[PDB]
Amino acid sequence: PTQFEERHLKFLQQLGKGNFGSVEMCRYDPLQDNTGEVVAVKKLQHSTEEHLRDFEREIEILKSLQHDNIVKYKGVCYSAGRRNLKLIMEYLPYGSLRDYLQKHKERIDHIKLLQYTSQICKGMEYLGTKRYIHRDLATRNILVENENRVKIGDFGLTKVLPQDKEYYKVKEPGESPIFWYAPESLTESKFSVASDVWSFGVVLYELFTYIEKSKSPPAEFMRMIGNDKQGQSIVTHLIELLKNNGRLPRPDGCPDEIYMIMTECWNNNVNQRPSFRDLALRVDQIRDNMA
Ligand SMILES: CCc1cc(O)c(F)cc1-c1ccc2c(-c3nc4c([nH]3)CN(C(=O)c3cnc(N5CCCCC5)cn3)CC4)[nH]nc2c1
């Protein structure tokens, strides 16, 4: 069932590419008659021992997850051995929520945005039960199954909390999604349920801007940082801005109670951010009040 042989994988098209790995749309066709299931397949380009260990950890996390709002794991292809593993996930033709929302915004009202928001909270609450910190919550990493269902994707950075600590410190982090990071993640590389809640605030911001390009978190933070950037890195300007209570502005058209939720997620103190359970409850009630 979870056994996939390289000889039966047929390349259909490219679906994405990072700095060290990529995603392809393949058909898994053991009958060789083109009736096989279409799947999304991840592989690494530059396979260093550390990238390999991270990839194996991503696969172990995916094997453990079964939820309606989490992308379905199918298996792994071990044909070329440990050095060239391939991860097999369900293929979702609607793609990312970031792209789907930009494409279908004329048929996606605030009530629909809140239905997606609730599903994301539910998926996140489930991750929390397993002590998993997603670390890359963003609309580009949430996938769409249909008009009524979204699923949390890209578990490439997901970490498991230590048994006795409420945070995981990442010893050696590569290129990071800084405009979605909590301040303690930027300054101390500390990741927790509370830093996933901060990122969730940024996701909610993305949704309510309807992915208007000029309003993206990098566009707004870069404008807020200003023109006079001499002497310090962008991460340094970002750390200072957030310490001085600089925040993404309220999208025009955004309900006040939704912006209030974002501002609470963006508390500088890890211990003062809302829980995903409370976020689901609040979002569900705002959505019920709208209709
Ligand atoms: C296997 C990797 C993985 C690992 C995980 O830990 C995880 F949690 C989830 C996934 C994962 C990732 C993407 C998945 C898609 C998908 N479905 C579409 C896309 N992705 C893009 N898309 C495209 O049309 C597309 C997008 N970008 C392209 N690029 C952009 C950059 C390089 C040029 C090609 C090409 N096609 C529209 C449909 N379905 N299932 C997936 C599952």
* Number of domains the chain is built from: 2
Phi, psi for 174 (deg, rounded to 5): -80, -140
Report the alpha-carbon distance of residue 26 to residue 14 in Å, rounded.
9
Residues 113 and 20 in one domain: no
For residue 118, give the CATH number of its domain.
1.10.510.10
Tell which residue, 91, 70, 95, 93, has the closest CA to residue 28.
91
Our CA angle for 210, 211, 213, nearest 5°, is 135
Report the alpha-carbon distance of residue 128 to residue 190 in Å, rounded.
16
Residues 74 and 97 in one domain: no
281 marked ligand binding residue: no
Residues 112 and 167 in one domain: yes
Ligand 1 mean position, distance from CA 17 (Å): 9
Residues 78 and 147 in one domain: no
The ligand 1 site (C-beta within 6 Å) comprises 14-17, 23, 40, 42, 58, 62, 71, 87, 89-93, 95, 143, 153-156
Ligand 1 mean position, distance from CA 40 (Å): 7
| Residue 110 amino acid letter | H
Experimental method: X-ray
Residues 108 and 80 in one domain: no
Tell which residue, 83, 169, 84, 172, has the closest CA to residue 133.
169
Catalytic residue among 136, 164, 256, 288: 136
State CA 201 to chain mean position distance.
12
SS3 176: coil
Contact predicate 238/221, CB 8 Å: yes
Domain end: 47, 71, 91, which one? 91
Report the alpha-carbon distance of residue 89 to residue 15 in Å, rounded.
12
Residues 9 and 134 in one domain: no
Phi, psi for 105 (deg, rounded to 5): -50, -30
Q: Atom of ligand 1 at shortest distance to CA of 153?
A: 8
Domain end: 50, 68, 91, which one? 91
Residues 158 and 28 in one domain: no
Residues 150 and 67 in one domain: no
> What does the CA dihedral 93, 97, 103, 106 come to, rounded to 10 degrees?
120
Phi, psi for 51 (deg, rounded to 5): -65, -40
Contact predicate 45/127, CB 8 Å: no
Domain that holds residue 259: 92-288
Sign of the four-CA dihedral 203, 256, 267, 127: negative
Residues 222 and 193 in one domain: yes
Say whether 109 is catalytic.
Answer: no
Report the alpha-carbon distance of residue 120 to residue 113 in Å, rounded.
11
For residue 76, give the CATH number of its domain.
3.30.200.20
* Both tokens assigned to 245: 């209570």
Q: What is the CA radius of gyration of the chain?
A: 20
Sign of the four-CA dihedral 192, 196, 146, 39: negative
Domain end: 67, 91, 115, which one? 91
Report the alpha-carbon distance of residue 127 to residue 225 in Å, rounded.
33
Cβ contacts of 224 within 8 Å, gap of 6 or more? 241, 246
